Amino acid sequence: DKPLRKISAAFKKLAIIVNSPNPEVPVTQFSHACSLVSPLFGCLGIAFKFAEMDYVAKVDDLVRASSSISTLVVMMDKDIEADCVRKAGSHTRNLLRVKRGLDMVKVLFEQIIASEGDNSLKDPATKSYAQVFAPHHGWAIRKAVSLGMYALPTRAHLLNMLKEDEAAAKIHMQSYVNSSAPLITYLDNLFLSKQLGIDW
Ligand code: NA
């Protein structure tokens, strides 16, 4: 029905949790919310094919795994205990990848809002990619992304795909931006407070 509204509702709930006394983020709830974001990358077209493995598959890995994990803290603590944080396919490694996707969407939305009046998505898509993902991508991937930018949908077409007009889309995009920001900071802090780094 209204995919942007399902996204804003899910992330509002996560923001409430992270801002609540003694916050506990359930892995099932978190992974499900992240899955609502997955189809946005496909909407943007071939420039963002990388996100299929870099984000969507990683979300799906966490959803699958979530049946046996309670909270993000517990999940990460078990990886620290086993000393497998940076191992391929670890819950915590996949979490870091998912966090980056949420952040790219946050910047994408911020930039769409900031460029209101522009009919193109090229600058918002380019700026969000270059800030969030380019630093983690090899040159050949970066080149491929730049070539796919011509195939972005028009801004109007994206809103059509999301079943919203400009006014409503602005409201729900801004909502996602407001909710995701504290969540992303909460996630970064899980890593930084345990000296794990976030740039790997
Ligand atoms: Na669970």
Q: How far apart are CA 151 and CA 95, in angstroms?
A: 29
Cβ burial of 62 (10 Å; 0-12, 13-18, 19+) is: buried
Method of determination is X-ray
Instruction: Give the SS3 label for residue 26.
Output: strand
What single letter denotes the amino acid at residue 173? M
Name residues with Cβ closer than 5 Å to ligand 1, which is an ion.
28, 66
| Cβ partners under 8 Å of residue 57, min gap 6 | none
What is the Å distance from ligand 1's center to 64 Cα? 10
The annotation status of 58 as a binding-site residue, yes or no, is yes
What is the Å distance from ligand 1's center to 27 Cα? 5
The annotation status of 137 as a binding-site residue, yes or no, is yes
Residues spanned by the domain of 158: 1-200
| Cβ partners under 8 Å of residue 9, min gap 6 | none
Q: How many CA atoms lie within 13 A of 33 on its CB side?
A: 22
Residue 70, token pair as written in the block? 């309670």
The annotation status of 1 as a binding-site residue, yes or no, is no
CATH number of the domain bearing residue 182: 1.10.3520.10
What is the Å distance from ligand 1's center to 185 Cα? 22
Q: How many CA atoms lie within 13 A of 37 on its CB side?
A: 31
Our count of domains for the chain comes to: 1
Q: What is the DSSP letter of 154?
A: P
Q: Single out the residue of 79, 77, 41, 74 nearest to residue 59, CA to CA.
A: 41
